[PDB]
Design a binder for these strands. Structure first.
Lengths: 240, 240
RNA sequence: GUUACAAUAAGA
RNA sequence: GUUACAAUAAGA
C-alpha cells in the first residue's frame, strides 16, 4: 500500500504549532487536490475513510500550554496513507504545486515528498497510533441526541469499532470482508481531545495489539482505524 | 541531595512485574530498616513524607494487561530519595543485609546500590515524575466518608497541594518555610490508578514546570511532591 | 515512521 | 536517571 512522507518547513524563527490543526490541514489538502483532481477531492471529503493522515510529527519540541508546540527541529513531517495509490498520487501533485500551508500563525512550505517503505503484516500485529483513533456512539444527554466518544475501556467500544470497520471496508473497498472477526487489546493508552472546526472530538492515542481478520488489518493499516479518518484520525504504524 | 539507585535482579523464570507494587515495596523496606534501626523506621512510616521512592524502573519491557510488565532487561532499578542523608544511608544498609524482595510472584535480589549525581535547581525547573503525584481531599459519598483524589484540572488542586507541601515542610524541616508560594504548569500529563493494599489511589504521571519558593522546590525534589510519598509517590527528576 | 508497549479507573 | 515536554476535556 502507498504511504507518503511530506516534509514541512516552518517559515519564521521561533515557530509555534497550534494544538488543534486537524481541520486546517485537512481542508487545506482538500482545496489543493480539488484544484487538480476534483473527482478525487470528493473521495477525500467522504466520511467513509478513503484515507488517513497522521499528526504533524515534530521530532524535537517544547510545550507552551497557551500557544502550542515549540518546533526546535529544522523541519516537521506529515504522513499520509491510503489503499488507493491514485489518491496518494493526486495528493503528492496537489501539494507540490501549491506547497503553502498556514496553520494558525505559522506558515509552512512543502519540502520533499517521498513514498515510504511499509512493512508486511503478520497474524498478529502491534500497532501504535500515529493520530488518535476515534470511535463514536450516540447517547441521550439532556434532550437532543448528541455524539458520545468511546475509548477501549468503554463497554461498547470493541463492538462499535468492529461495525465501523466492516461498514467502512465495504464502502471504500466495494465488497464486504470474508473474515469480519477481530479484537484489539490495549497496551499503552491515553485520551486526547481535539477541536476540529467548531466541534470537539475525543480519541485514543494508544499502542495496541490487533488479532483476527487479515483483510480488516490491511484495511486499518492503509486507511486508518475508526471514524473521521479523512480528518487526520486513525492512522497507525507497525511496531514490535 | 542524597539519592540512591538500588538494583534488583529477577529470580523467576519469566519475570512478570505486577502493575501495582507500592505497598509491597514500602512495607518490605519498612522492615529491613526496622530490624536494623527501629528509630529511623518510624520516619519512613510517617504520613508526612520523610522520603520518596519511584516506580520500579524497567528499561526493556512489554505489557501483559492481565498479568503485569514482562521484564526483558537483566535488572530493574528503584530510586530512593530524601532530604535526610541519614535515612538514605539506613535504607541502603538495611536492604543490603536483607537483599531478598518479594513482589507478587516475582522474587528479586538486591544488587548494587549506588549514589546518583543530582543537579542543582534553578529559579525555574522542569520536573518529571518518577512516581505519580498524589493530592487528596476528603468528601462525603452519601452518608459515608470518602477519599477523593485530585488532578491539576481540578479547581482545588493547586490550593490543596500548596497546603500539603507547606504542612509537610514544617512537620519535617522543623520550621515553616519562608517563601510559601509556588505555581505548577503542566507540560505532559497522564492519570494513573494504583492499588496499594486494600485501597485505590489515583494520581498524576506528568512533566511540569515549577515556579516559586526555592526551599519548597528543593523539598519536593528531595522528599517528593504531594502526599503519601512514603508509599513511593511524588518522586521527581529534573530535566531540560 | 522511535513521541516505540504502565494496563486498570470512584472500588468499601 | 532519557518510560525525558501533545496541553486542553462532554461543548452547541
Amino acid at each position: 500500500h502507498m504511504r507518503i512522507e511530506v516534509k514541512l518547513l516552518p517559515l519564521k524563527d521561533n515557530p509555534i504549532l497550534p494544538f488543534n490543526y486537524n481541520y486546517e490541514v485537512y481542508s487545506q489538502i482538500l482545496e489543493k487536490v480539488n484544484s487538480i483532481e476534483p473527482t478525487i477531492a470528493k473521495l477525500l471529503s467522504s466520511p467513509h475513510g478513503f484515507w488517513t493522515f497522521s499528526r504533524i510529527i515534530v521530532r524535537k519540541r517544547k510545550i507552551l500550554p497557551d500557544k502550542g508546540i515549540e518546533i526546535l527541529s529544522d523541519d516537521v513531517s506529515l504522513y499520509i496513507s491510503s489503499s488507493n495509490e491514485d489518491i496518494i498520487r493526486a495528493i503528492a501533485e496537489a501539494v507540490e504545486k501549491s506547497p503553502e500551508f498556514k496553520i494558525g500563525e505559522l506558515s509552512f512550505l512543502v519540502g520533499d515528498i517521498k513514498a515510504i517503505k511499509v512493512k508486511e503484516l503478520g497474524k498478529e500485529n502491534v500497532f501504535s497510533t500515529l493520530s488518535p483513533i476515534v470511535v463514536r456512539t450516540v447517547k441521550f444527554e439532556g434532550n437532543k441526541l448528541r455524539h458520545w466518544d468511546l475509548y477501549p475501556h468503554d463497554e461498547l467500544f470493541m463492538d462499535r469499532l468492529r461495525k465501523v470497520m466492516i461498514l467502512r471496508y465495504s464502502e471504500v473497498m466495494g465488497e464486504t470482508p470474508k473474515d469480519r472477526d477481530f479484537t484489539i487489546e490495549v497496551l499503552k493508552f491515553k485520551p486526547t481531545r481535539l477541536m476540529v472546526g467548531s466541534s470537539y472530538i475525543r480519541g485514543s492515542l494508544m499502542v495496541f495489539r490487533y488479532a483476527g481478520s487479515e483483510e480488516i488489518a490491511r484495511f486499518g493499516y492503509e486507511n486508518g482505524f475508526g471514524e473521521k479518518t479523512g480528518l487526520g484520525f486513525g492512522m497507525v504504524k507497525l511496531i514490535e
